[PDB]
Scaffold this active site. Sequence first.
Site, PDB file in Angstrom:
ATOM      1  CB  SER B 127      -0.955  -0.073   1.184  1.00  0.00           C
ATOM      2  OG  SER B 127      -1.797   1.066   1.224  1.00  0.00           O
ATOM      3  CG  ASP B 151      -2.089  -2.619  -4.545  1.00  0.00           C
ATOM      4  OD1 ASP B 151      -1.999  -1.609  -5.270  1.00  0.00           O
ATOM      5  OD2 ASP B 151      -3.180  -3.092  -4.168  1.00  0.00           O
ATOM      6  CB  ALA B 162      13.008   9.549  -8.456  1.00  0.00           C
ATOM      7  NE  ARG B 165       6.912   7.855 -10.075  1.00  0.00           N
ATOM      8  CZ  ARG B 165       8.021   7.468 -10.691  1.00  0.00           C
ATOM      9  NH1 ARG B 165       8.932   6.730 -10.078  1.00  0.00           N
ATOM     10  NH2 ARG B 165       8.220   7.829 -11.955  1.00  0.00           N
ATOM     11  CB  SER B 167      12.553   6.200  -8.453  1.00  0.00           C
ATOM     12  OG  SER B 167      13.714   6.119  -7.649  1.00  0.00           O
ATOM     13  CG  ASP B 170      13.648   5.209  -4.974  1.00  0.00           C
ATOM     14  OD1 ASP B 170      14.306   6.271  -4.992  1.00  0.00           O
ATOM     15  OD2 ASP B 170      12.419   5.169  -5.195  1.00  0.00           O
ATOM     16  CG  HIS B 236      -5.116  -2.873  -1.772  1.00  0.00           C
ATOM     17  ND1 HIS B 236      -4.319  -2.805  -0.651  1.00  0.00           N
ATOM     18  CD2 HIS B 236      -4.881  -1.737  -2.468  1.00  0.00           C
ATOM     19  CE1 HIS B 236      -3.622  -1.685  -0.676  1.00  0.00           C
ATOM     20  NE2 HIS B 236      -3.943  -1.019  -1.770  1.00  0.00           N
TER      21      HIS B 236
END
EC number: 3.1.1.34
Lengths: 434, 434
Positions: B127, B151, B162, B165, B167, B170, B236
């Site tokens: 999540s 998910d 990036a 969020r 990337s 990362d 989910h």
Amino acid sequence: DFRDIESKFALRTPEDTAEDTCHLIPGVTESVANCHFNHSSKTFVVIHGWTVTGMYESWVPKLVAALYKREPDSNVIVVDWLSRAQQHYPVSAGYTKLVGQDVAKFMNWMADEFNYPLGNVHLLGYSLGAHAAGIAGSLTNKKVNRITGLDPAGPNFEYAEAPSRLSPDDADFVDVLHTFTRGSPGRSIGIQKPVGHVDIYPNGGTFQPGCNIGEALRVIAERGLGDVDQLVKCSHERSVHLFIDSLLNEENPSKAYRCNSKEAFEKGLCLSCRKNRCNNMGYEINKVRAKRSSKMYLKTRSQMPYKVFHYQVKIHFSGTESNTYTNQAFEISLYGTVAESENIPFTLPEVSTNKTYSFLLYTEVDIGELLMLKLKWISDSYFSWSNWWSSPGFDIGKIRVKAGETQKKVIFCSREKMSYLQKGKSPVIFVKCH
Amino acid sequence: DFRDIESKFALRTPEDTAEDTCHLIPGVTESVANCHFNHSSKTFVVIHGWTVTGMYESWVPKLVAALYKREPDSNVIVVDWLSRAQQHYPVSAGYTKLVGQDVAKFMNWMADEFNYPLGNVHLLGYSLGAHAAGIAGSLTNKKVNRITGLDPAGPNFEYAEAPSRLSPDDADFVDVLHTFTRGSPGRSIGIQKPVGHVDIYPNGGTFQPGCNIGEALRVIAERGLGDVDQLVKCSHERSVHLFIDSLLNEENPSKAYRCNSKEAFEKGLCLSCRKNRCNNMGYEINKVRAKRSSKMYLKTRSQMPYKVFHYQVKIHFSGTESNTYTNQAFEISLYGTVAESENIPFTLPEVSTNKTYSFLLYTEVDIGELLMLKLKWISDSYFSWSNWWSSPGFDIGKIRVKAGETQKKVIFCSREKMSYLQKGKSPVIFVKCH
């Protein structure tokens, strides 16, 4: 500030009590995680001493094995005197300060990074190691619970002070095993001046029984050439052997006694301990504080079990003939309810009449209670020359033996008329009475 | 600089996969020693996500239990989103940055005090947790091996970059499970833009089979009132269930396939993987780097075993009558050497003549090899009305099914003359040939 260590701290385990496997490098926290270290349990610290060879003495493995046996799930740390102790002995005396500073830095680093409680560590010190630990801890901020040493070194430490030698203030509690003190003051290997709150002087420190003359000759025998070198080291290792024996036999600790002097203890007037005296010896020692140095004494068996008893005796000699005699040998024997000794001798000079005497006796077998007694009086004229003509004799009334471990003023009691102790004669029986 | 944590890191063990027992407080090294932490082995990090309730979702215990089952003697860390995630959902979107900074500080502290190798940690993200981990690690100096998420959240992360969020840069390697994407771009809960080096889009992401309509009514049913709330959360949690199933069944991982688009995969022209394609899915995924986003597709069973096969087919339709038909249902069945399916249907519109077609088929039972085939053609006129008069029909020559897991261009083969596939008629048998 952790680059001048030059003394690796090892961490053995019960499965490996011979070879050092780990290396708890100070500052480098990685070692703690690398080798399991229960931060909750107690953790000992063994500090061995000078060694002519380049390896640990033969007693460390047994000591550590017994330590694990007694207190499992408890960490053990060993030091690496090697590379510095091999040097000249005085050089080791000087380097004691460096090793003490190193150990203090180690413990401070532990108390900073892991804040391990300092009240759960023993600085087991032997030979020079005891003085090393003593100079250590004192630099520690949070003090140390126990600093129990073994046979503290005498040379270059007598006529000294706390900073340069083991002191009672170096730790919360302290105890030493003065297993050897023969020689002139300030020159005997084993320091004779009391150091800790409580000190132990087995056999008086003159020597130990589990050995012999040893070195037959300088070249024929082995002074330090192995072989009889251990025999020459009759007592210096008896401290550690006593400690390990006590550790292994937790159920029945030997009860060392508190007194005023070795001669007084030999006489046997200083055994009763109504107050906080006659405390245990070894791991199960009772933690106590004293206003001053408190000497103690006891005896022991040869090597394996130790743990002897103490049954000091008094005699109310009262006879008719008043010719005083001196330097005579008295032989007695006792029978109990578990076992019995047979032919234990003892000595008592300056024998007189209408006078009471006393002495100290020891046995090496459990007896529990005691029923009857033997009081033979020996002579060097066994043959029938001195079997008829009147030889010196006395009369015996009561006897006031006192059990050591348990205070029992059992009153032995001569028979109605059948005593008349005489030289070269059958002993005189006695029984429980009154 | 370790007083703004406000997110406790827990450390469960196989014997306790429900309640957090430890608390690895950053900076305070005591916790590491308090709770065993094998610094040699691999260590996962589970980051759960938003929860309307004030407790961990129902999947964490199963996930951690399976993780221990797969990789024993390996540490597991859990986070405490609670007290911050309960707030409004956008507030959690903002707090993702704080939690990422916190995790980065945690990992940096670990790599400083214990220099634990960063190449042995997974930031399992679900999540919002996936985006939290993605924003994390990037601040870490030594990067992270695997950042496998589950998910990833879509809202407030599409049309981003990036730093804000997850990337590909990362971490060293990354993979995501796009288990839900239905809805308009930028508003579906599940981000549809590919993020990692390799991404997985089971069932195309439209939905999942192991569920139903769910909410019957706003008041009568239970929107978020427990009960049918889980049913509403059809997909989910399917990500985590798929991951745990793959983890448990290490012997026979499901082989997700690489393609160009969901429609292309449905057609079935993009299954062969001679190059580094069609990599595994789950823990046993093969670490690979790609020059760009690499989409993938596959199918699955309902809930328990998953791990379905893929047996795409081609037909060389060649008949006489040239009246084209559209939107017709083809039913086929196959028999093998281990088991056999019976009545699996499929669809193929725009049927013509002298033309070759293809489609994708899936089965949920192991078959191994395959011997014969069924090619029934269904109709909505079962009764004998359309059993005599000439109904449309075709002729079948060869068939070129291709096994998925193992590349086998087995050439099926119509019989000498006994085919004439016709509507509302018995299927046509085929056999191995050539």
